[model samples]
Target chain A: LFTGVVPILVELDGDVNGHKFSVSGEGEGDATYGKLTLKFICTTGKLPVPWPTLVTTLVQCFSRYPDHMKRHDFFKSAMPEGYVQERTIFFKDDGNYKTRAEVKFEGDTLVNRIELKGIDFKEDGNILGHKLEYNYNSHNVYIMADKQKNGIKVNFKTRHNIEDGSVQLADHYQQNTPIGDGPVLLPDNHYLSTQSALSKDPNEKRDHMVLLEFVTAAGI
Target chain B: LFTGVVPILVELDGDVNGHKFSVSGEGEGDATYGKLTLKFICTTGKLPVPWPTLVTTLVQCFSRYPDHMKRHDFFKSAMPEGYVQERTIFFKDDGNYKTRAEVKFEGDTLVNRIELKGIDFKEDGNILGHKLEYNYNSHNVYIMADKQKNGIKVNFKTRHNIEDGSVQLADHYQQNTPIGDGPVLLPDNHYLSTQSALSKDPNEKRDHMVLLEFVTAAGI
Candidate 1:
């Protein structure tokens, strides 16, 4: 049922370095609910490496749900006799931001909602990398569901706002994936430059790009 | 945490067996999320046995949620590697009404949402149970969730309407269980007869009852 273009729709609007950028598009779903991905890459304004790592890591937590469903019969199967426990862990916490990860088994699927709040990119500049540091903020929440062994699907229904230090930079991302799939439309990266000029610098050259990819058992 | 009162609140107003009855009360919760029972027994005006069975069956489906969570580790565990298939079965179907049953492993827990639509209790009167078979319609929907290895809790947020043949009859049940444990107030079954006279039949005597119960790891 995962076909048409109305399921996964996303919008990204933000400014990096000395330029303004916006990305809006739809994502396709796997025909048989196998492998699904919503990857976004930014190659402008020298974003921090941890930003992408944290984002992708959050997505990976949901990616494992379907695979777990494929391995167990949630309805008829019974939990074995023994000691069983559930835990919520935090990988990093540095005052201004923290990441709380919770994993639990629901029926036959292993589900996780890794939460990240008040992330400040400027504080992580001690890694001895780029001389330019930009302050950014982010919040992430996702809901994942799967239909038996067919595949897993994730839907995000929260507004993410990012702003840099003093300059008031903003980035907003919103997505809602349909429960029933039809025909999904892949977003085009060319729409990033459709907005009016946003840079106030005269002698600086800024080239920003936002790339989105959706892959499944059907095709990329 | 289920201590005082507030978690489960329900309201029922309708006429049954020639008498009008209404019930409003709160249900308690299992402190540790173990066994939860929300049983409402109505013994008035010859209410069909199938009516209560259908309602209790729906509640039993969610009662298994916490027990399922206690049986398996949702995180840091994997489903067995092998043959697995998911199925949705129907127990009854007669054009106007049907029951759909679906079961699947969500991680380590076995969850179910048994659905019944457009049920008419008057049609099952040929089993030599009772002579007066009043037509009663019902619809049920519930959402169950449990903490990892803890217990299961169900919150229902759907309005149910029942109407008999010729005469109009209605009953409503709505519940919203909190995510965090708090004080819960068990409903009092003694309040079923607080209303004024509602029976139109002068010689026919009618008595109705709705009993609510909540049990968990703590106590009933």
Candidate 2:
């Protein structure tokens, strides 16, 4: 038999762009047991770039880190570890690049499912130069290739955002290379993998897939 | 023609029991032309000893070193100043005590007035026993008393709650002797002289007066 429960407190500490963030909370509890959970979500807000400087700076920081796996590590380590990345997407200056990754963690295990759709930068340039649409899914699982003894299968149906006319790429990057073999790793350090890529050119639309599988220590 | 004015801050470094009471405040204008008045007041809700304890404690502490002008210095230097005595009268077994002090300063001169009142306490003892009160008025003057010069005058009054009735005492202690003549001459010492003392015995419904004086100074 249980009487009551209360959360004692929660503490968070981490940094992003030289800025540190900390949060904590406490709740009431009883003798038997008590539990408390704290969650931190980080998302991009307007990017702070004017139309003129947007293309240049975006190309500098974004284009240089295009691979989803590399970008994920770059972003994760740049910020406090436990913070969740929400609605991540990228676009290129030519108005023809887009990519996204759906990431979730279960206990200590990380499950990442990625897709790249509509790599038509020149086509979308006329409509909206380098605009990105983010897609997030809670059910997807991202596994590291180094830790996977046997390949794991992710069964998520592809979906597109009607507003941007973006499609989902259906491929996974497998852990074949020592460094670029994980679901998050990429052949090129500057090119990131994402679900959908926006195109500024009104005529061109390209789809690509790269399925990834890997394994690491049983728990992260 | 306008003359320049000097501003200064007076700092008093002394220990009250284990608690350190450091007095520091700003003074405006030149000390030669400025007048300063400082007052310190300490009040409590309700105490057990009405007024005798307060008066007796003050007088006793003052008389400890007849030669000293300020009684507080004597009490502070006493092996164990009059705190024991103050405790018994200021507090009842069932009550608590709170004291506050207010001080004023002008240029190089200062005057301090203090008032102590009682708050809540146990009622087992005499109801009147739960009351305690004390008010102190002091001033700082530049003049030093000589054998022929009349010493300054200080007037003290006290009131207490007794079972039969309340007791009130008022008197003046005159600076009759050269500031250094009345008490033990320890080396560097000074005193402030005051004249007059008055008393009212509630039981007899009579009032009386006594003439006296004292001295106070800073030591090396």
Candidate 3:
């Protein structure tokens, strides 16, 4: 049944501190539903925080995402809620820079695109792309999209641990910790959020097999 | 039927790298519903970025809401998607900032809030507020509640340009630019995000009824 793990891959480039930058990562599941192998590089100038620390603790924290679903769950659970909303307004397409982007969702597959107006590689613009596939079972996904006039492209795949580790990560999330040497991520939030969510299901499995899963949770 | 434009009003205070600050704006649309008329002040220190930019390209830019919907859009559009999958579990109202903020949409209205803990404004213990009216016709809004215990308050009635100008701003707007030679103010997103909501039909229209609204669209 559940076997190989999905190793997610990611790449991104853009601005910060009014300067250009790039970052990428890979893990099981996907950036959307997985761990991160992300990095921050000042594309042109020195890293904006030009006089910054190696910030190893911060970097180390993100790397573990590949190990479990609980980690992914914790990340999502750690949000003000359990999910960070993402919406894409598509504009141009296929490197043409001046065309109507196409959008569609066919089961586990998503086909879409949005414009990248400048010299660039905006994050969601490329991610707001074409024909992305996901697997609830393995939490893996295959991504394919064209390079735009802005020079952005998304082409990779993600895989998730089947059923257990995501919960494990959640079971011991560090929302309350100050971290290796960082400010609190959810400064105003109580520490128990991640704990309770992962606890309720101990390890709820994603029913990817069933198409279009809808929630029947009460108290809406 | 869309008559007077809504001039969105706003105010907030906080810290970044120990640098305390505050910001407010009054635009044709509410901060919750329109464009921005914001001002940012470094109340605590001289602004951590003392070695920062006196760049006005940076400043004049935030003034336009359309030139790059990608900029403004991805901002709201790129929420964790504005509406994170928030599922509350903590319990508090002011300094109990340790609770999970709850969320839901009541028709055209959205119900939500986050705590403005510490920095002297934890009055909500954590729950910043509650029903916000949005600008379907002119992109403005009405938010209610006493000023935060920290003395922060936002109450305004925006009047949009049936054609081009807002007499109300004769009304009130600091437009000549160059205060510290900075950018248009719209600070601390993390603040308002907690105060307002990820409103409905975010692409909700601003009634363009003045008979002479302009955007000379070309033919297909």
Candidate 4:
């Protein structure tokens, strides 16, 4: 039902790789089929492991179209026309990188989505090291929204595990529960902010506290 | 001092190149030197000419730093370190183009800004149509904000010019006057909307009417 593009903003703050860090990102996305791009900026150093997975789940979670909404029948009629081209070109005022992309689609089916590798850094290798290589071994990602849609709970099933110098997929999705205080909602009712923490056990004191802010834009 | 990136949105509805069209864009921009990226979506076909120039001026206009704010002294201290690298990595969830950039700065001075061209469209040549080749012959862009900062007027110095086949640099910046209704301000006080029109003379009936919306983001 969303015909127009939407703006998205996400913030992640917590201790990672033994240092306190905060990162924020902004971009555009559509409600249909999870078509979105996020450009991230970290205040401290590089983002540590498991972040890519965390981001993927978050994007996928928001990608959900309202359950009641129905897909358009125009796709069936559009099928005969072959495919339509969709593109986005990005430019910075300082005359930096001009990034763009084009996707081919026929009816409701994606035909060819072109890919481009834009930039790379030497130290970036250390942060992502061997993390995305792992598979989503557990179907732990969960979301609970109130009927009034006041707020939603985003949680991942996590179990305490011990390891040294290794990454854990479960811990990546942890967040401090909004138990006492309800999730902070901006006046627009679309901005949601919550505090989170990575914990070894439910009884233990919370550590690695992180704060998240998500902006759900209206389709336009 | 814009410490955090702010989200921005703009809408333009008008008749261009013999067709009625509407275009909207969303992105993130700080209050500083207009470091922003706008991803535009047009409901009709491709965006017509004079848009790029209009976009450049709009971006540059909003790029203004506050009058009283001063640059940080830390930049001077940072000079000894040569340059700090700033980078943004963009990713789409559906496995599309991965765009990124790294700009070097030393003591608030830009050292080197690398550029990468990410996408190319064959039919896109018809839209641009050699319009940006013209220089800013007249400094027509102007912004007037009220004392209470209730709203602002963005007007371009336009004079009636007669041209048959060629493009005029001035027409790109036309917008209807928000004279009677005043500017429409959103609850956030950051969003402003106004109406505009393109005309060849002051007495002529307003045709090619346009609507403009600008979102001034808070610094962080």
By lDDT, the best candidate is 4
For candidate 4, the per-residue lDDT at A106 reads 34
- lDDT per residue for candidate 4 within A93-194, as digits (tens), equals 111111111222334432322221212312233233322221111122333333353333334332211112122323222221111233332111121111
Every candidate's DockQ is 0.01, 0.00, 0.01, 0.01
How far does residue A199 in candidate 1 sit from its true spot (Å)?
A: 69
What digit string (tens of lDDT, one per residue) describes model 1 on residues A102-199? 33333333333333343333444321123212111111222222344222222222111112111111232322222223322222111100000011
| Candidate number that wins on lDDT, 2 or 4 | 4
Residue B144 lDDT in model 2?
A: 29
Q: lDDT of each structure?
A: 0.25, 0.25, 0.20, 0.29
Which ten contiguous residues of candidate 3 chain B have the minimum total lDDT? B211-220
Per candidate, chain B TM-score? 0.28, 0.25, 0.22, 0.35
TM-score of chain B of 2: 0.25
lDDT of 2 by residue, A1-220 (tens): 1133322232223222233333222222222211111121212222211121111111001111213334333222221112222222233233222223333332332323232233333443422332322221111223332334222222222222212334323222222222222333222222121111111211313221111111111112
lDDT (C-alpha) at residue A31 in model 1: 21
Kindly list the per-residue Cα lDDT of model 2 for residues B80-140, writing each as its tens digit.
1112111222332333323322223333332222333444534454433333222121222
Candidate 2 chain A: worst 10 consecutive residues by lDDT? A210-219
Interface RMSD of 4: 24.0
Off by over 4 Å in 4: A1-220, B56-62, B66-141, B144-167, B171-220
Best by TM-score: 4
